[PDB]
Design an enzyme around this catalytic site. Structure first.
Site, mmCIF file in Angstrom:
data_model
loop_
_atom_site.group_PDB
_atom_site.id
_atom_site.type_symbol
_atom_site.label_atom_id
_atom_site.label_comp_id
_atom_site.label_asym_id
_atom_site.label_seq_id
_atom_site.Cartn_x
_atom_site.Cartn_y
_atom_site.Cartn_z
ATOM 1 N N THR A 212 0.985 -9.731 -14.742
ATOM 2 C CA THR A 212 2.411 -9.315 -14.853
ATOM 3 C C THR A 212 3.308 -10.557 -15.008
ATOM 4 O O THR A 212 3.038 -11.567 -14.335
ATOM 5 C CB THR A 212 2.836 -8.464 -13.653
ATOM 6 O OG1 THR A 212 2.698 -9.271 -12.488
ATOM 7 C CG2 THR A 212 2.020 -7.206 -13.497
ATOM 8 N N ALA B 196 9.374 -4.563 -5.036
ATOM 9 C CA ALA B 196 8.587 -3.322 -5.233
ATOM 10 C C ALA B 196 8.302 -3.052 -6.714
ATOM 11 O O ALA B 196 7.630 -2.041 -7.002
ATOM 12 C CB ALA B 196 9.274 -2.137 -4.587
ATOM 13 N N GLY C 182 6.279 -4.728 -8.787
ATOM 14 C CA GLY C 182 4.803 -4.834 -8.936
ATOM 15 C C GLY C 182 4.133 -3.614 -8.346
ATOM 16 O O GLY C 182 3.156 -3.125 -8.893
ATOM 17 N N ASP C 183 4.725 -3.055 -7.303
ATOM 18 C CA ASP C 183 4.222 -1.820 -6.646
ATOM 19 C C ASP C 183 4.406 -0.628 -7.612
ATOM 20 O O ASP C 183 3.400 0.063 -7.903
ATOM 21 C CB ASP C 183 4.868 -1.705 -5.262
ATOM 22 C CG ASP C 183 4.494 -2.829 -4.303
ATOM 23 O OD1 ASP C 183 3.351 -3.296 -4.376
ATOM 24 O OD2 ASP C 183 5.365 -3.235 -3.483
ATOM 25 N N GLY D 58 0.827 -1.217 0.000
ATOM 26 C CA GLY D 58 0.000 0.000 0.000
ATOM 27 C C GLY D 58 0.849 1.249 0.000
ATOM 28 O O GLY D 58 0.676 2.083 -0.913
ATOM 29 N N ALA D 59 1.740 1.375 0.981
ATOM 30 C CA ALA D 59 2.624 2.558 1.138
ATOM 31 C C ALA D 59 3.507 2.692 -0.102
ATOM 32 O O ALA D 59 3.672 3.855 -0.564
ATOM 33 C CB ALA D 59 3.442 2.448 2.391
HETATM 34 N N1 LIG Z 1 13.700 -8.466 -15.012
HETATM 35 C C1 LIG Z 1 12.760 -7.596 -15.365
HETATM 36 N N2 LIG Z 1 12.959 -6.861 -16.478
HETATM 37 C C2 LIG Z 1 12.016 -5.982 -16.839
HETATM 38 N N3 LIG Z 1 10.859 -5.693 -16.245
HETATM 39 C C3 LIG Z 1 10.705 -6.423 -15.129
HETATM 40 C C4 LIG Z 1 11.576 -7.369 -14.635
HETATM 41 N N4 LIG Z 1 11.067 -7.920 -13.458
HETATM 42 C C5 LIG Z 1 9.920 -7.310 -13.276
HETATM 43 N N5 LIG Z 1 9.645 -6.387 -14.253
HETATM 44 C C6 LIG Z 1 8.530 -5.453 -14.347
HETATM 45 O O1 LIG Z 1 7.826 -5.395 -13.118
HETATM 46 C C7 LIG Z 1 6.497 -5.975 -13.301
HETATM 47 C C8 LIG Z 1 6.165 -6.866 -12.129
HETATM 48 O O2 LIG Z 1 6.932 -8.105 -12.235
HETATM 49 P P1 LIG Z 1 6.411 -9.386 -11.427
HETATM 50 O O3 LIG Z 1 7.575 -10.195 -10.953
HETATM 51 O O4 LIG Z 1 5.325 -10.037 -12.226
HETATM 52 O O5 LIG Z 1 5.707 -8.641 -10.174
HETATM 53 P P2 LIG Z 1 5.680 -9.045 -8.628
HETATM 54 O O6 LIG Z 1 6.968 -8.435 -8.056
HETATM 55 O O7 LIG Z 1 4.408 -8.500 -7.967
HETATM 56 O O8 LIG Z 1 5.697 -10.543 -8.662
HETATM 57 C C9 LIG Z 1 6.532 -6.672 -14.671
HETATM 58 O O9 LIG Z 1 5.280 -6.638 -15.345
HETATM 59 C C10 LIG Z 1 7.541 -5.820 -15.441
HETATM 60 O O10 LIG Z 1 7.003 -4.630 -15.966
#
Ligand SMILES: Nc1ncnc2c1ncn2[C@@H]1O[C@H](COP(=O)(O)OP(=O)(O)O)[C@@H](O)[C@H]1O
Ligand SMILES: Nc1ncnc2c1ncn2[C@@H]1O[C@H](COP(=O)(O)OP(=O)(O)O)[C@H](O)[C@H]1O
Lengths: 300, 281
Positions: free
Chosen positions: A217, A245, A247-248, A39-40
């Site tokens: 994602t 962070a 996904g944040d 959230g933050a």
């Molecule tokens: N290695 C990476 N290279 C480029 N974009 C990334 C990478 N890892 C994450 N992202 C970006 O961050 C978003 C969230 O990644 P994800 O791992 O699915 O989220 P969460 O951390 O909530 O699991 C992705 O949709 C993408 O835009």
């Protein structure tokens, strides 16, 4: 204007050679303490991208509580609806390996005390988008959607961390935003792989349990969207230091893109830009990029 | 008394990536192999001193006053400008642990006063401090006329100098393998500890072997949490030898402490009292 309803956590972080497998003791270094919480982080993410933002949630009557609230205010998030709570703030136990892959275990603390009656209507007045996550109780998420619709806001539910969802929530959401583990939880059967095609098919399946725009994602493979279009949005090539962070950043950037009036095509590209940049610095909240970095990376 | 020279740690619904066990516990208790071994002796009704470094943080205070309230002499615990274990535990007692040495990495040879070693019968050491400090602690022990108990844990390579300077070398099956080569699939564990060799090799629910050549069976118990089993055994063995029990009755006394540790959740909280271990006799 965006309202964010959700968690505030103090992040206790360790660099580790290798994430511990079960039964394993691993040696770490570089112990660190930063304000965090889904959230933050999403509120702060919106602020660094130059959107106006309120935060509604609970901190404890501990040192961390003050640090969580002040942290937000300093970033210029409106903290009038952050409530003080007996007992401890949320705390999060984070390990990060050299590839930037992480492991997080959350102690909810005061986040568990954010009840439906804690949600006043004035926190939602004139907001264009409400941004929710699941480090707070599900009855509070339902009330937030209800109050959101009543004020004419778009309900963005980031269903994370992974949790089973009742029909009442899934049916009241304009956009449902999940990673692959959250998508698999809610659908049964993982995408044990990507083809971007496979998670499009799962995002179409999650589409069946509502009437929202559905966004999945894929970390290093970007994101897919089943809604008024069925489309993949590629990742920006970056060097990943700590995926914490990301996904944040993405959630917060999607929220503000839609708040500002961008279509889904533009808002999803903007969000991959911001989630990519978040991987390139260490720690959760400190890694949240600013408008001009994000815009640089988009412009190419 | 017994002098313990080693570590102090404070031991402290998840984003999965890489994956966590499905289970919701951690909160706050004094730990670390040094602290645990000292409290073990103290709970087993033994006179014991703790020598090592805490930090200038609230934890540092909590660790010190913690050991004190258990009956450990903390006089020699040096404040430092604390060691931390992030513990995740599932309902089946399975653990994931990430250790940050903090102050423990700053315990250097010149930190060890000879005063602390005076009159002590056993010096108990583990490998959770720099190797050069273990070397110093051994040398000061020998001078003060104590039996030096090296618990070569956690798993690490050791030079011939250190191995040749100890009176008892306490190890488990992974450490035994590290120092020699090739896991004991059992006895073969007894032929590996003789390849090491007083050398004590712990075997979990198969108890412990010895050669300076015998095997001491486990006490059969309900194993819910194996954390601090090594610490209770190490502490108990150290107390059996400082109390003047034979090696046979001491190794039985170790297995009995070791087994009782497995039967309760956590690390320091699961360490048995004397009345308990004596009943299991
Ligand atoms: N290695 C990476 N290279 C480029 N974009 C990334 C990478 N890892 C994450 N992202 C970006 O961050 C978003 C969230 O990644 P994800 O791992 O699915 O989220 P969460 O951390 O909530 O699991 C992705 O949709 C993408 O835009
Ligand atoms: N399941 C068990 N049943 C009985 N005694 C046990 C059990 N597990 C451990 N012990 C006792 O506690 C000790 C456990 O040490 P062990 O598991 O071999 O290595 P570690 O140092 O990794 O804990 C002694 O080996 C043994 O006496």
């Amino acid at each position: 204007m965006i309202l964010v309803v959700g968690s505030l956590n103090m992040d206790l972080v360790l660099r580790v050679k290798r994430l511990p497998r079960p039964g394993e003791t691993v040696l770490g270094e570089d112990y660190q303490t930063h304000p965090g919480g889904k959230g933050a982080n999403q509120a702060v993410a919106i602020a660094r991208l130059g959107g106006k933002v309120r935060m509604l949630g609970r901190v404890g009557e501990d040192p961390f509580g003050q640090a969580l609230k002040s942290g937000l205010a300093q970033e210029g998030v409106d903290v009038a609806w952050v409530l003080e709570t007996p007992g401890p703030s949320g705390t999060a136990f984070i390990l990060v390996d050299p590839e930037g892959q992480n492991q997080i275990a959350v102690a909810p603390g005061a986040n568990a005390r954010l009840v439906p009656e804690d949600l006043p209507a004035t926190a939602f007045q004139g907001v264009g988008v409400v941004l929710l996550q699941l480090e707070i109780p599900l009855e509070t998420v339902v009330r937030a959607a209800a109050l959101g619709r009543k004020a004419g806001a778009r309900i963005l539910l980031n269903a994370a961390p992974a949790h089973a969802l009742p029909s009442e929530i899934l049916q009241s959401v304009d956009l449902l935003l999940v990673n692959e583990v959250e998508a698999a939880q809610l659908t049964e059967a993982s995408p044990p792989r990507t083809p971007e095609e496979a998670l499009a098919l799962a995002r179409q399946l999650r589409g069946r349990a509502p009437q929202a725009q559905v966004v999945l994602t894929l970390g290093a493979q970007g994101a897919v969207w089943s809604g008024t279009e069925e489309s993949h949005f590629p990742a920006f090539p970056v060097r990943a230091v700590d995926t914490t962070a990301a996904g944040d950043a993405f959630a917060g950037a999607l929220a503000l893109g839609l708040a500002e009036g961008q279509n889904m095509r533009a808002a999803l590209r903007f969000a991959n830009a911001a989630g990519a940049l978040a991987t390139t610095r260490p720690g959760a909240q400190p890694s949240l990029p600013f408008r001009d970095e994000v815009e640089a990376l988009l412009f190419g």
